Amino acid sequence: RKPPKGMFLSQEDVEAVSANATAATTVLRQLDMELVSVKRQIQNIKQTNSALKEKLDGGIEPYRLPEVIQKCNARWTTEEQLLAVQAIRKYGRDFQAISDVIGNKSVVQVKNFFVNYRRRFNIDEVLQEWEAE
Amino acid sequence: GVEGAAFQSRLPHDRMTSQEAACFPDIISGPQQTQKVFLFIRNRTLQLWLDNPKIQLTFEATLQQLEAPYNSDTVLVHRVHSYLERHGLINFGIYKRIKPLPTKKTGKVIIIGSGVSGLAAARQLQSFGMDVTLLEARDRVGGRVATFRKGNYVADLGAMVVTGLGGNPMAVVSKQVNMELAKIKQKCPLYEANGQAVPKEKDEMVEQEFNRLLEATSYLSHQLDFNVLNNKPVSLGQALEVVIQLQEKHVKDEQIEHWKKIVKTQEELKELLNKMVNLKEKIKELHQQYKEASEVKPPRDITAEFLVKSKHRDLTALCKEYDELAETQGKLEEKLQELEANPPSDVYLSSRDRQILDWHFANLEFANATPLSTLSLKHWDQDDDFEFTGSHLTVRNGYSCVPVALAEGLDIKLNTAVRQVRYTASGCEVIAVNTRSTSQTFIYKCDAVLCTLPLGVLKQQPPAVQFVPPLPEWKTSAVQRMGFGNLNKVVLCFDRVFWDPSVNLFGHVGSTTASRGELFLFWNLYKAPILLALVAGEAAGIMENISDDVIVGRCLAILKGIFGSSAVPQPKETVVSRWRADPWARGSYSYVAAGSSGNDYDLMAQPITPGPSIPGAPQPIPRLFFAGEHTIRNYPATVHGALLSGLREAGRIADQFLGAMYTL
Ligand SMILES: Cc1cc2c(cc1C)N(C(=O)CCc1ccc(-c3ccccc3)cc1)c1c([nH]c(=O)[nH]c1=O)N2C[C@H](O)[C@H](O)[C@H](O)COP(=O)(O)OP(=O)(O)OC[C@H]1O[C@@H](n2cnc3c(N)ncnc32)[C@H](O)[C@@H]1O
């Protein structure tokens, strides 16, 4: 019912290897030639990516920045209100990046800040200007 | 039990055969009880003969030892016995006539060839009170059961193996004739061209692949019905090439999709690095920016403060994107190192591997005595169903004693080449010459002629035996279609055993696939220091046109390579077979050629009935009968098959001319 395990031979294949006197060599010489073509391609991406790995020497260790601990205070100093409005214009609604900019305020206080000072700071107008980008 | 007898007589113990339906149509169409009785009566009689086959089993003797309820019907027992005795299932071979043989001879039969089929028919026909004479071209009986004998040296150049006593009639003959039977140890180490033994891990690999490839063909023939190609029948050799090609193809299909996985990832990585380099460049300049904004020292207005804080968030943000990317770069970096160290199979079979494969092919070309390119893919293994159980043996004293034992007490004209067979409505005329001087002409007249001419003889063109009138188109066509093969033997007589005497046989791997069979197998079978070297497949016919000395040379070399140049002395005496060259054989045994089938073996056995001498006269009796190894569909190319065919025709002939009184 099934061919002996580890012996492959499908109805499809056998015909292709039987259609002509040299057909068996012809198909096998295709795969032989096709395998070298894919083999040469492999060398190419190895060479290409060996290059792309030199450009990444040193990683980004020198461009990295130290981290600062920062206890989330809930008071809004007049300065850090102003950082918020500029952030809003710079980012729009990335509540998280905005929280990162102030550095002492978390997304919630960040988030409802948009509502407590919505009138007083013309936040819609700021966001409207931020849309155009 | 009694049931062992039915098996040993090649008969299903629990149902009636087509044979018996013919002689006992009442019992088979009859109630299932009367059947069971019969089959027991059969099996038990078969038993009684079998237990001691050195004495005739007379009907009276049978009935005595049978007990009721079964010995109540004396006519059944008499019918059963007479049927068994007719068709040589009992009282065949070399028994001791209890009743000395009545000289009231009825009928005259001429048997062509003193071969084992011929020998067996002649004893049966004579056993049945007929006048039998055997005609014989050679100056010895046996035909293809030849046996070399010079001094202490003994070695058959014909058959040497008894394939199993499990249901083998040779079993009975080995008790009637003192045949010294020795088993054949299966272990056979292979030695390559250089002379070094194939390593065990390699041996087992190739052999397994061999059987693997043989299943492959069978699946391809039965399931895929790959049995015609270009309006030609497919041979086993073709179907093997196709299977090997498709395995060599699969090897490549595997490497192709392996590297395709590898280059998919390289490309997938190469596009990762591109993001990495561009992002790093971006990070590079955004640093400078954050730095320049940091340099404007405080006190600063909120926009200048915002610009430090935000270029700081911005640069950390890109520092996380690029951090996650070398997290992913590591994730593909090892995968490429894995798949490169998980490569699939380099080849399907190496040059050295295949050379070992060929020996398994040479061994298989010897078993069928023909190049695998000629064997029928569909049918070459149809006899491989009826195999006997037990292990294959050899005959230490030479297989020549069997024929000679049979030839006792028979009219055998040796040096008598039959040359025209002439059969008509009123009888037959066989015309033979003397072989030594073809001058002397002989005319033999008889009621029937039994032809055990080798198939290769029947094949010969122009014909070496003329049939008058000619054999009909259905019988000749069968003869063309069938395969007659060729397998040669070289016998090496030495004064000292320098081989492993616990190895019955060892092989030699040939250099190329073209000469795979040139002396690819050796046998240590005898008490005297003798080695036999086989020549199979394509090599066989090619080597018949080559000087013996040369052949023994190539032999010597091979052994020297295997055992060292100083351990192998010149052989004292040497012989080499040239079976296809022999004109009384013109081959070794029949094979199931492509385009042939088992049906042809049955064609070969149907007897010929001539046309009426006077038009309008009634249908005549059959006069030409055929036996011989090519005539027995179930057990061809074997000594037992020849024998059974001989027993068979003697049963057929006798029912025809003495009458069958056992059908009431
Ligand atoms: C030549 C040769 C023949 C055989 C062998 C070797 C050789 C070199 N044997 C082998 O190594 C292995 C073969 C084998 C083994 C197992 C299996 C097997 C298969 C399936 C399952 C299990 C096992 C298959 C094969 C060998 C063997 N038979 C055996 O069981 N044991 C063996 O181990 N085999 C075959 C055996 O050898 C023959 O099959 C049988 O011997 C033939 O007997 P017949 O055909 O009845 O009779 P004839 O043909 O012998 O005699 C003809 C007479 O006609 C005369 N004649 C001609 N022309 C004229 C004329 N014009 N006028 C007057 N007379 C004429 C001729 O001169 C001779 O007088």
From Swiss-Prot, chain A:
The SANT domains may bridge the nucleosomal substrates and the demethylase KDM1A. This is REST corepressor 1. Essential component of the BHC complex, a corepressor complex that represses transcription of neuron-specific genes in non-neuronal cells. The BHC complex is recruited at RE1/NRSE sites by REST and acts by deacetylating and demethylating specific sites on histones, thereby acting as a chromatin modifier. In the BHC complex, it serves as a molecular beacon for the recruitment of molecular machinery, including MeCP2 and SUV39H1, that imposes silencing across a chromosomal interval. Residues 24-59 form a coiled coil. It is found in: Nucleus. Phosphorylated by HSV-1 protein kinases in case of infection. Residues 71-122 form the SANT domain. Ubiquitously expressed. Interacts directly with GFI1 and GFI1B in a RCOR/GFI/KDM1A/HDAC complex. Interacts with INMS1. Component of a BHC histone deacetylase complex that contains HDAC1, HDAC2, HMG20B/BRAF35, KDM1A, RCOR1/CoREST and PHF21A/BHC80. The BHC complex may also contain ZMYM2, ZNF217, ZMYM3, GSE1 and GTF2I. Interacts with REST. Interacts with the SMARCE1/BAF57, suggesting that the BHC complex may recruit the ATP-dependent chromatin-remodeling SWI-SNF complex. Interacts with SOX2. It comes from the Eukaryota. The chain holds residues 311 to 443 of 485 of the full protein. Belongs to the CoREST family. Residues 1-74 are annotated as: Interaction with KDM1A. Transmembrane segments: none annotated.
Curated annotation (Swiss-Prot), chain B:
Component of a histone demethylase complex with RCOR1. Component of a RCOR/GFI/KDM1A/HDAC complex. Interacts directly with GFI1 and GFI1B. Interacts with INSM1 (via N-terminus). Component of a BHC histone deacetylase complex that contains HDAC1, HDAC2, HMG20B, KDM1A, RCOR1 and PHF21A. The BHC complex may also contain ZMYM2, ZNF217, ZMYM3, GSE1 and GTF2I. In the complex, RCOR1/CoREST strongly enhances the demethylase activity and protects it from the proteasome while PHF21A/BHC80 inhibits the demethylase activity. Interacts with the androgen receptor (AR). It comes from the Eukaryota. Histone demethylase that can demethylate both 'Lys-4' (H3K4me) and 'Lys-9' (H3K9me) of histone H3, thereby acting as a coactivator or a corepressor, depending on the context. Acts by oxidizing the substrate by FAD to generate the corresponding imine that is subsequently hydrolyzed. Acts as a corepressor by mediating demethylation of H3K4me, a specific tag for epigenetic transcriptional activation. Demethylates both mono- (H3K4me1) and di-methylated (H3K4me2) H3K4me. May play a role in the repression of neuronal genes. One of its GO terms (biological process) is cellular response to UV. FAD binds at residues 117, 136, 138, 144, 160-161, 629, 638-639. It is found in: Nucleus; Chromosome. The SWIRM domain may act as an anchor site for a histone tail. Belongs to the flavin monoamine oxidase family. It comes from Homo sapiens (Human). Changing residue 117 to P: In AIMAH3; uncertain significance. GO terms for cellular component: chromatin; chromosome, telomeric region; DNA repair complex; histone methyltransferase complex; nucleoplasm; nucleus; protein-containing complex; transcription regulator complex. Acetylated by KAT8 in epithelial but not in mesenchymal cells, thereby regulating the epithelial-to-mesenchymal transition. Acetylation by KAT8 reduces KDM1A association with nucleosomes, thereby decreasing histone H3 demethylation, leading to transcription activatio of target genes. The lineage of its organism: Eukaryota, Metazoa, Chordata, Craniata, Vertebrata. Residues 256-342 form a coiled coil. It catalyses: N(6),N(6)-dimethyl-L-lysyl(4)-[histone H3] + 2 A + 2 H2O = L-lysyl(4)-[histone H3] + 2 formaldehyde + 2 AH2. Residues 2-101 form the SWIRM domain. There is a cross-link at residue 331 (Glycyl lysine isopeptide (Lys-Gly) (interchain with G-Cter in ubiquitin)). This is Lysine-specific histone demethylase 1A. It is linked to Cleft palate, psychomotor retardation, and distinctive facial features: A syndrome characterized by cleft palate, developmental delay, psychomotor retardation, and facial dysmorphic features including a prominent forehead, slightly arched eyebrows, elongated palpebral fissures, a wide nasal bridge, thin lips, and widely spaced teeth. Cleft palate is a congenital fissure of the soft and/or hard palate, due to faulty fusion. Residues 128-664 are annotated as: Demethylase activity. It is an enzyme of class 1 (oxidoreductase). Changing residue 363 to A: Strongly reduces demethylase activity. Its cofactor is FAD.
